[PDB]
Write a protein that holds these residues in place. Structure first.
Motif, PDB file in Angstrom:
ATOM      1  N   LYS A   1      -1.136  11.827 -12.705  1.00  0.00           N
ATOM      2  CA  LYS A   1      -0.494  13.125 -12.643  1.00  0.00           C
ATOM      3  C   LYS A   1      -1.349  14.175 -13.345  1.00  0.00           C
ATOM      4  N   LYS A   2      -0.946  15.436 -13.194  1.00  0.00           N
ATOM      5  CA  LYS A   2      -1.730  16.525 -13.764  1.00  0.00           C
ATOM      6  C   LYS A   2      -1.734  16.478 -15.285  1.00  0.00           C
ATOM      7  N   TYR A   3      -0.580  16.236 -15.904  1.00  0.00           N
ATOM      8  CA  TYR A   3      -0.462  16.371 -17.348  1.00  0.00           C
ATOM      9  C   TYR A   3      -0.220  15.048 -18.061  1.00  0.00           C
ATOM     10  N   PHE A   4       0.811  14.286 -17.699  1.00  0.00           N
ATOM     11  CA  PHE A   4       1.129  13.108 -18.498  1.00  0.00           C
ATOM     12  C   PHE A   4       1.003  11.792 -17.741  1.00  0.00           C
ATOM     13  N   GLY A   5       1.755  11.569 -16.679  1.00  0.00           N
ATOM     14  CA  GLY A   5       1.913  10.221 -16.177  1.00  0.00           C
ATOM     15  C   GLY A   5       0.981   9.878 -15.036  1.00  0.00           C
ATOM     16  N   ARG A   6       1.350   8.838 -14.298  1.00  0.00           N
ATOM     17  CA  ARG A   6       0.801   8.546 -12.986  1.00  0.00           C
ATOM     18  C   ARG A   6       1.943   8.572 -11.986  1.00  0.00           C
ATOM     19  N   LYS A   7       1.598   8.677 -10.709  1.00  0.00           N
ATOM     20  CA  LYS A   7       2.619   8.754  -9.679  1.00  0.00           C
ATOM     21  C   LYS A   7       2.079   8.152  -8.395  1.00  0.00           C
ATOM     22  N   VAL A   8       3.001   7.808  -7.501  1.00  0.00           N
ATOM     23  CA  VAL A   8       2.621   7.413  -6.155  1.00  0.00           C
ATOM     24  C   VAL A   8       2.268   8.663  -5.364  1.00  0.00           C
ATOM     25  N   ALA A   9       1.076   8.668  -4.768  1.00  0.00           N
ATOM     26  CA  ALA A   9       0.595   9.862  -4.081  1.00  0.00           C
ATOM     27  C   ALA A   9       1.479  10.216  -2.894  1.00  0.00           C
ATOM     28  N   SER A  10       1.856   9.220  -2.101  1.00  0.00           N
ATOM     29  CA  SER A  10       2.601   9.477  -0.877  1.00  0.00           C
ATOM     30  C   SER A  10       4.049   9.811  -1.204  1.00  0.00           C
ATOM     31  N   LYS A  11       4.486  10.997  -0.801  1.00  0.00           N
ATOM     32  CA  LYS A  11       5.869  11.409  -0.981  1.00  0.00           C
ATOM     33  C   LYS A  11       6.730  11.137   0.243  1.00  0.00           C
ATOM     34  N   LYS A  12       6.152  10.615   1.316  1.00  0.00           N
ATOM     35  CA  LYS A  12       6.877  10.389   2.555  1.00  0.00           C
ATOM     36  C   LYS A  12       7.421   8.968   2.622  1.00  0.00           C
ATOM     37  N   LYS A  13       8.511   8.816   3.373  1.00  0.00           N
ATOM     38  CA  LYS A  13       9.130   7.522   3.602  1.00  0.00           C
ATOM     39  C   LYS A  13       9.068   7.063   5.047  1.00  0.00           C
ATOM     40  N   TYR A  14       8.909   7.974   6.001  1.00  0.00           N
ATOM     41  CA  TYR A  14       8.796   7.624   7.406  1.00  0.00           C
ATOM     42  C   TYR A  14       7.551   8.261   7.998  1.00  0.00           C
ATOM     43  N   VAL A  15       6.981   7.588   8.990  1.00  0.00           N
ATOM     44  CA  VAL A  15       5.824   8.088   9.719  1.00  0.00           C
ATOM     45  C   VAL A  15       6.079   7.895  11.206  1.00  0.00           C
ATOM     46  N   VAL A  16       5.555   8.809  12.020  1.00  0.00           N
ATOM     47  CA  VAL A  16       5.839   8.750  13.447  1.00  0.00           C
ATOM     48  C   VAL A  16       5.046   7.615  14.081  1.00  0.00           C
ATOM     49  N   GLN A  17       5.608   7.038  15.137  1.00  0.00           N
ATOM     50  CA  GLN A  17       5.142   5.776  15.683  1.00  0.00           C
ATOM     51  C   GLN A  17       3.885   5.971  16.540  1.00  0.00           C
ATOM     52  N   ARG A  18       3.412   4.862  17.113  1.00  0.00           N
ATOM     53  CA  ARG A  18       2.061   4.793  17.667  1.00  0.00           C
ATOM     54  C   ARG A  18       1.939   5.589  18.962  1.00  0.00           C
ATOM     55  N   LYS A  19       2.927   5.472  19.850  1.00  0.00           N
ATOM     56  CA  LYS A  19       2.897   6.172  21.129  1.00  0.00           C
ATOM     57  C   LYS A  19       1.648   5.729  21.894  1.00  0.00           C
ATOM     58  N   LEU A  20       1.676   4.494  22.388  1.00  0.00           N
ATOM     59  CA  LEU A  20       0.565   3.889  23.101  1.00  0.00           C
ATOM     60  C   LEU A  20       0.429   4.525  24.473  1.00  0.00           C
ATOM     61  N   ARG A  21      -0.633   4.129  25.166  1.00  0.00           N
ATOM     62  CA  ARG A  21      -1.003   4.736  26.435  1.00  0.00           C
ATOM     63  C   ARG A  21       0.046   4.474  27.507  1.00  0.00           C
ATOM     64  N   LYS A  22       0.081   5.363  28.499  1.00  0.00           N
ATOM     65  CA  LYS A  22       1.031   5.214  29.593  1.00  0.00           C
ATOM     66  C   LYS A  22       0.711   4.013  30.471  1.00  0.00           C
ATOM     67  N   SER A  23      -0.568   3.684  30.629  1.00  0.00           N
ATOM     68  CA  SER A  23      -0.998   2.632  31.535  1.00  0.00           C
ATOM     69  C   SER A  23      -0.830   1.241  30.944  1.00  0.00           C
ATOM     70  N   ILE A  24      -0.307   1.141  29.730  1.00  0.00           N
ATOM     71  CA  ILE A  24      -0.181  -0.123  29.018  1.00  0.00           C
ATOM     72  C   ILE A  24       1.209  -0.673  29.308  1.00  0.00           C
ATOM     73  N   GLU A  25       1.269  -1.724  30.111  1.00  0.00           N
ATOM     74  CA  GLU A  25       2.494  -2.456  30.391  1.00  0.00           C
ATOM     75  C   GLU A  25       2.261  -3.934  30.109  1.00  0.00           C
ATOM     76  N   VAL A  26       3.338  -4.715  30.173  1.00  0.00           N
ATOM     77  CA  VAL A  26       3.256  -6.115  29.776  1.00  0.00           C
ATOM     78  C   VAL A  26       2.395  -6.906  30.754  1.00  0.00           C
ATOM     79  N   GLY A  27       2.613  -6.727  32.046  1.00  0.00           N
ATOM     80  CA  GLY A  27       1.898  -7.584  32.968  1.00  0.00           C
ATOM     81  C   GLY A  27       0.464  -7.216  33.263  1.00  0.00           C
ATOM     82  N   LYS A  28      -0.031  -6.104  32.729  1.00  0.00           N
ATOM     83  CA  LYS A  28      -1.325  -5.584  33.145  1.00  0.00           C
ATOM     84  C   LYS A  28      -2.456  -6.516  32.732  1.00  0.00           C
TER      85      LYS A  28
END
Lengths: 64, 207, 86, 103, 201, 125
Positions: free
Chosen positions: B23-50
């Motif tokens: 931290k700036k003055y006294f302690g330490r902290k976890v840098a990341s303040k977020k709890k959720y992140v947006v998902q991968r969103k893979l390609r349109k041409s990616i299907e199971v049987g391909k």
RNA sequence: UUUUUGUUUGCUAAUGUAAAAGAGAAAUUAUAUAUGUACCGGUACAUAAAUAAUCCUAUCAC
RNA sequence: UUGGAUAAGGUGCCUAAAUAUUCGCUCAUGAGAUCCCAUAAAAGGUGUUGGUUCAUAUGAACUAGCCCUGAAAAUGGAUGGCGCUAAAGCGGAUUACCGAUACCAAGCCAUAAAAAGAAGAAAAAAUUUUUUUUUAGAAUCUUUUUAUGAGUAGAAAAUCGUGGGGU
RNA sequence: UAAAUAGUACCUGAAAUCGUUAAGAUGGAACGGAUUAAGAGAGAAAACAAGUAAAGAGGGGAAUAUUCUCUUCUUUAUUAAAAGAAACAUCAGUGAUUAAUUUAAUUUCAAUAAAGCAAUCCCCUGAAAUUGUUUUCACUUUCUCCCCGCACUAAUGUGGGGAAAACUGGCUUUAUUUCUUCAAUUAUUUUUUUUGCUGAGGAAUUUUAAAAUUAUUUGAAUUUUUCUUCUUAUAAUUUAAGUUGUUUCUAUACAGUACUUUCUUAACCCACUCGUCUUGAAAC
């Protein structure tokens, strides 16, 4: 900011104050370039300086 | 869970936060303040049987069948080992050019598509993650070369988490063996390796 | 206060709505107006266009008169030149 | 036969450049079968490998690679600009690079 | 540009355009071999080009002509000098590019049995209007003092006869292979046959 | 060229050399600002011996600290480590050049039991 | 001249690439036309005219 | 410093970018080819390209574009060189592109100015108990913010060294 | 002699200059700037492993010459963690690229199929009879016909002279716009493909508040709704409130062929002799 936009677009009662409050815009070079800064926009040859009238909009868009 | 500002529905998955900064003055902290992140969103041409082409691994140029989107962006793939020699491998999307042909567009394989999905529903990323204990055992023997290689193979085989993947591989390959083999030109297509000839222009040819 | 990243006030929706409290309503109205089905406009295109016939009539008339004036000036100048020739 | 290719071939031209001035942060690359800006734009996110041999061994191997990535097209004739982790040496001008199909 | 070497048949090409294309290729690192350099064309009349070469010949260091501009009369050497003038030959890279070029008069032993390419951007037929004068580099060189033109001509006619014999043999072989292909197209499976027919093979 | 190691950015390496010190033995390479009249370097001609300037200055958050991310402190005594007892994590110690072997051994012992790192730990042994 | 292993007192084992990834391609010529064949430069007939925008070569292990 | 985009000027090669597109003109047995700039005139041409005014597709007279004559110097020689004529020349037009230490966004150094200031637990790793870091308060100081940065003669400040003296 | 590389020129013993050995470069200068690459020297103080158990050598402190405790080295085996770098992904900032898009304005058009009008005639356009108004002829295709040359052409046709309707072209009605078209420009809006670079900071009493989004809930409005808006309350999240995560590798090492660094060589681009007087110096 919408009030500022209104006062600037329509030269409203609070125009000098808004304009002075606003820092001078620092524009980018035009995306497709100029024609010739040397020559006037109204010269038959390609040119840039002078009153562009409504044609300033596309130049601002490329410069912004 | 999701958010759809401007109509997007970006989909949020939980994310851990492990990087720690002072931290700036006294302690330490976890840098990341977020709890959720947006998902991968893979390609349109990616299907199971391909059927796709591997581009980077020791199986580069080989052709494989997509198996499952693995909940972490990577996707499981099986170039059925009984026909191709490509094992059940978790691969990254961008290291994989996917073609336009589905294994399940064939009449004799759309029947067993459901069994394929049932077999593939039980693979996960943890199965592909290498265990610390077996990693330590493999690195222990580094302190002749043929014996080292053979012992590495033996440790990998005896890893309990590899065996379940091998079983899934075996059952999927048994399911897909005769139908694939009875499409003779397609079987050779799968067993073949994609190479870039000097007449094909890859900004003109289609995946 | 510590300076932070200057969020794009045009594309970042949260700061855009912060700056313009009416923007969310304006954009929603634009989106729902865009969402109108094609059948209504397909069936109303001719109804809308047929009402512009009188405008087209006066619109042809003004340009016709303008070209008539141009031609009359041309004819007058030609006649003046013919008179000057002799 | 063996040793599959699955990359497009390119040639290292000079640096990003004007007359009598160089910008060795970008390298001009000519790709084999591309001759237009539109076709060069196809290979824009692609990784580039400059694979070169060496007189002696460095990690048990006589070969090492400088990694880079296509950034944007250059000119109108299909030349591209590539940014590498380290500036490629001008001794490499005219040598071969691999424009890989990944990502 | 991506070959081990490019053999260019210089017949009917304009000297300056040919030299510019060759110089760019060499700088990019492509080895080229220019053959039949005596048949290069130059725009402008033969007398005009001869006047230009006489201007070049009158040029020498009067203190010591040995150090002077070496003039070189062979058309292959003339093309080589033009390419060098289009090239930064005083640097190491430019010198490598210059040495990557090989010029010949006629077609010598290895280069008469490999494919010769042509640069359309430098062809006289495409770059000069039919009513405008041009000259032949071999003729200009002979007027300037080369005096090997006719020998190159007879070597060329001999090579033409040999190539004609080879071409006749090649045409017969191609016809036989074509008839074999048609006779074998009926023996493969119908599905493969339809694939080949659909894709024009 | 800049070199970046972690949070440390060295904006420039290969320290500036005095103009024309390469071809005059009486001119030492230690930097001197060329006063001159027509001095090329002073006028900032292209391709010759650029002059140092304040723009090259290092980030003051990581200015004086060594590649071990610690500030160096030069000691000549065992008694000059008491300040380091409270700064063991951001100060490394360096023994002065003219300290004998006995005192060096004592200082290394004290630094180790103070878990303070020593730069020239294996000097004179 | 062929095979295996290697080039990881000043010396006495010993390595370099301006460019491998299918680095594939031999007719000649005219450009207000050419080329083959058959008869006696001519006659007749075929071929070619986005020509490499093509053709040829690759994977079928044991 | 990292990216981006441009100015002037260029895009046949030298040389990054157009042997780009589109419309005309020009053949020079000393063509021509970017302000300053690196000379050219009077006078001519039955070269060719457009125009103008007179005479029953003809004869004239003009006019002005490019070209030609006029146009001769001494070491060998210079549109910068190569070379270029379906221009790579001349006059336009349309696009794309390349191109600065200038412009834009971001980082950092310093200068100037400004806002403000004389005390309490944070995290992580092991297993409730330990361990590892920190837990700040120097006023020509500390934190943060914005703008700005050529420089001879000359001036000033802060720094860096040397002999010797007191502490 | 401690020392003679302290041997009388004798403390130390710099530079210029020269010798030996090694390595490298070497086409009418040499050196250099900037950027890397290849070699060759060095290097671990961030450039992994804190701790735990045993035995071996030790040092201290406390406890009334005997107990506990703290630690430093060496070995054994026994576990983490973190740091950097790459790849991928996410977000944000800043660009590049390719597909579009709402609503309006501007004489737009162009088709489909059923009728009709005009025939040198039509939408047009052209030439003639203090402004408007009106009139005349002259304007089209033919793969049509007739005559003359009657094969004369660039021509699978042609030149000249006459007729024909109306395919073509134009106009007038009705239905349609997915057969086909619905353009272009401007104004006003909303998206989208593939991607380059960047990540400052780290908020003990404003990284709060709000803003947005999600899930409930209240009332209202309204463009009338699966992104409609405005609030009432709750709980959260980030699009707020400047980059975070995963996996590998370094690596299960104690210094090497890797990593850091110095030096030597190249290579691309650039680079004239410094000081001075001077308007002006690389100056013959």
């Amino acid at each position: 900011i919408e009030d500022m936009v209104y006062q600037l677009y329509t030269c409203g009662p609070v125009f000098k104050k808004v304009n002075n409050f606003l820092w001078a815009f620092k524009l980018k070079p035009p995306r497709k370039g100029f024609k010739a800064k040397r020559h006037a926009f109204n010269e038959p040859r390609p040119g840039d300086w002078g009153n562009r009238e409504a044609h300033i909009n596309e130049l601002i868009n490329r410069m912004i | 869970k999701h958010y759809n500002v401007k109509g997007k529905k970006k989909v949020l998955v939980p994310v851990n936060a492990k990087k720690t900064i002072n931290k700036k003055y006294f302690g330490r902290k976890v840098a990341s303040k977020k709890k959720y992140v947006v998902q991968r969103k893979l390609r349109k041409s990616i299907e199971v049987g391909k059927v796709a082409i591997i581009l980077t691994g020791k199986h580069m140029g080989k052709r494989c069948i997509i198996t499952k989107i693995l909940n972490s962006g990577l996707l499981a793939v099986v170039g059925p080992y009984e026909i191709n020699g490509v094992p059940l491998k978790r691969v990254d999307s961008r290291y994989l050019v996917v073609t336009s042909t589905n294994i399940f567009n064939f009449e004799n394989i759309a029947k067993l598509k459901d069994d394929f999905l049932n077999y593939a529903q039980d693979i996960d990323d943890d199965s592909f993650i290498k265990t610390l204990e077996i990693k330590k055992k493999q690195k222990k023997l580094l302190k002749f070369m043929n014996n080292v290689i053979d012992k590495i193979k033996e440790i990998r085989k005896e890893d309990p988490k590899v065996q379940k993947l091998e079983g899934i591989q075996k059952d999927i390959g048994s399911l897909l063996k005769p139908e694939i083999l009875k499409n003779k030109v397609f079987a050779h297509y799968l067993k073949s390796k994609f190479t870039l000839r000097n007449d094909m222009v890859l900004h003109k040819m289609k995946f | 206060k510590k300076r932070l990243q200057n969020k794009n006030s045009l594309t970042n929706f949260a700061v855009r709505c912060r700056l313009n409290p009416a923007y969310k309503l304006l954009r929603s109205l634009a989106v729902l107006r865009m969402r109108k089905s094609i059948l209504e406009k397909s069936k109303n295109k001719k109804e809308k266009r047929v009402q512009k016939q009188i405008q087209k009539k006066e619109l042809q008339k003004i340009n016709h008169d303008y070209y008539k004036g141009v031609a009359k000036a041309v004819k007058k100048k030609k006649k003046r030149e013919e008179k000057k020739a002799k | 036969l063996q040793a599959v290719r699955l990359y497009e071939k390119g040639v290292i031209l000079g640096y990003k450049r004007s007359q009598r001035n160089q910008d060795p942060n970008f390298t001009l690359i000519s790709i084999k079968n591309v001759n237009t800006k539109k076709h060069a734009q196809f290979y824009v996110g692609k990784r580039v490998a400059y694979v070169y041999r060496t007189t002696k061994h460095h990690d048990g191997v006589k070969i090492k690679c400088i990694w880079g990535k296509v950034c944007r097209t250059h000119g109108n004739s299909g030349v591209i600009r590539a940014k590498f982790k380290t500036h490629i040496p001008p001794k490499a001008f005219g040598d071969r690079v691999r424009i890989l199909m990944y990502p | 540009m991506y070959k081990k070497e490019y053999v260019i048949d210089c017949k009917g090409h304009l000297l300056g355009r040919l030299a510019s294309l060759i110089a760019k290729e060499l700088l990019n690192g492509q080895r080229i071999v220019a053959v039949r350099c005596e048949d290069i064309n130059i725009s402008g009349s033969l007398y005009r080009n001869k006047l230009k070469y006489q201007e070049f010949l009158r040029l020498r260091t009067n203190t010591n002509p040995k150090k002077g501009p070496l003039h070189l009369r062979e058309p292959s050497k003339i093309l080589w000098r033009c390419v060098r003038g289009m090239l930064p030959h005083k640097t190491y890279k430019g010198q490598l590019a210059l040495k990557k070029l090989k010029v010949c008069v006629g077609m010598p032993y290895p280069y008469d049995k490999k494919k010769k390419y042509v640069l359309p951007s430098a062809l006289r037929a495409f770059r000069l209007k039919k009513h405008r004068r041009y000259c032949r580099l071999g003729t200009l060189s002979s007027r300037v003092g080369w005096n090997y033109d006719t020998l190159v001509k007879k070597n060329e006619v001999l090579r033409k006869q040999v190539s004609k014999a080879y071409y006749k043999k090649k045409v017969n072989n191609l016809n036989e292979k074509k008839e074999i292909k048609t006779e074998a197209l009926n023996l493969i499976n119908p599905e493969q046959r339809q694939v080949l027919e659909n894709f024009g093979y | 060229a800049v070199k970046k190691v972690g949070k440390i950015i060295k904006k420039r390496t290969k320290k500036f050399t005095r103009f024309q010190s390469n071809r005059f033995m009486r001119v030492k390479p230690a930097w001197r600002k060329p006063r001159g009249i027509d001095c090329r370097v002073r006028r900032r001609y292209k391709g010759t011996n650029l002059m140092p300037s304040i723009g090259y200055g290092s980030n003051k958050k990581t200015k004086f600290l060594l590649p071990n991310n610690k500030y160096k402190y030069v000691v000549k005594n065992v008694k000059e480590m008491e300040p380091l007892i409270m700064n063991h994590t951001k100060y490394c110690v360096q023994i002065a050049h003219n300290v004998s072997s006995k005192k060096r051994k004592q200082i290394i012992e004290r630094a180790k039991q103070m878990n303070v790192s020593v730069i020239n730990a294996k000097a004179r042994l």
